[PDB]
């Protein structure tokens, strides 16, 4: 038969009170139009696994996750190339200008502001590593987590 996808979407996507686009990786994304928010896609691919959906088989054992994303990482590639396809709809969302004033009518990229903003996320992920309890030594561990979402991490 046809191809099936096992997803784990956020609870608020059920009520009406969404589109999937292939945007360039900063290092597939889901975006809302009615609610205005950007989400990333993550697939769980383990060697030797297959699903048994009701009365049908699905090889691979792929588990997709609809997890939120801060647009500051996605929109960063647009001003990273200067140093000093579906990308158009990605930026044009309410409350973007106030969000822009952390990294970058006129808009200019800054390194000093980006360095302070990235240093706050490391201290923000260190608490998640303390809440979810991931196996201080957390400094390099929390730094390595943001490195999978930005290419400037090599310089940081």
């Amino acid at each position: 038969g046809a191809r099936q996808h096992v997803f784990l979407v956020s609870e608020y996507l059920k009520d009406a009170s969404l589109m999937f686009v292939k945007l360039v990786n900063p290092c597939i994304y889901l975006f809302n139009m009615c609610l205005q928010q950007l989400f990333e896609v993550k697939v769980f691919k383990e060697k030797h696994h297959s699903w048994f959906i009701n009365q049908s088989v699905q090889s691979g054992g792929l588990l997709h996750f609809a997890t939120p994303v801060d647009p500051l990482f996605l929109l960063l590639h647009y001003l990273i190339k200067a140093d000093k396809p579906n990308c158009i709809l990605l930026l044009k969302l309410p409350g973007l200008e106030k969000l822009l004033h952390h990294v970058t009518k006129y808009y200019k990229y800054s390194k000093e502001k980006t360095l302070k903003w990235l240093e706050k996320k490391v201290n923000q992920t260190v608490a998640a590593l303390k809440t979810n309890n991931v196996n201080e030594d957390y400094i390099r561990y929390a730094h390595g987590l943001i490195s999978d979402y930005i290419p400037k991490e090599l310089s940081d």
């Binding site: 597939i28 561990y141 999978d148």
Partner: protein, 249 residues
Amino acid sequence: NTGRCRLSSPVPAVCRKEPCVLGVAEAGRGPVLGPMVYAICYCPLPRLADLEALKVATLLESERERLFAKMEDFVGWALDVLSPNLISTSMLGRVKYNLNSLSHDTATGLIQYALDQGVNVTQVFVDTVGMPETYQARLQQSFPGIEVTVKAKAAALYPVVSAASICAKVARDQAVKKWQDYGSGYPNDPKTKAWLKEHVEPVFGFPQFVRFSWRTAQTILEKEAEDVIWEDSSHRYFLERGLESATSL
């Protein structure tokens, strides 16, 4: 019962006091279909004259049912029927536990059972297929206090083994009659080969009654049924979690 199944007759008063003799013989070792049974027979040493009349050397299905009825005051029995799913799971498990070692651990179990019930066993007879030298030494080391004897001609040599063989053969027949057109059940039979091929599921394969562990059962699955691959045929965080960034959708 779960995997295997043990059916037993109550221990007769004579067995617990007078010195007894045990016999071990199997039925259903070679078929791809159905379960495997193991039966033991025990009688006091002076009552060997009575069993001398109900001993073979072959016997027909009607005659074996008749012989089983006579054995059923001094003669005691115990069965051990291993399901075809249990046989499939024993051999196909992550650690290979061959039919030879599966059959022989079922033999030592029933002998222990008789010793656990209180039967005054002094000597044990065993029926094998090929070399008994390695089989005798293993059962002699397991039961050091009793004289263990293993022979391939045991069923034709002693009446205790023939009675234990009739009990294993009738139980094997009763079990397949309870399930009931395949033929005999053995891989060599062309009617059996024809039945298996007509009962193959692309995802699942054969039912519980089919011993998958057999080379005959494993070959057919590779042709008709779908290919199934098992466990044996920073970047560090996601590699340890088995997660990766999506690009497929």
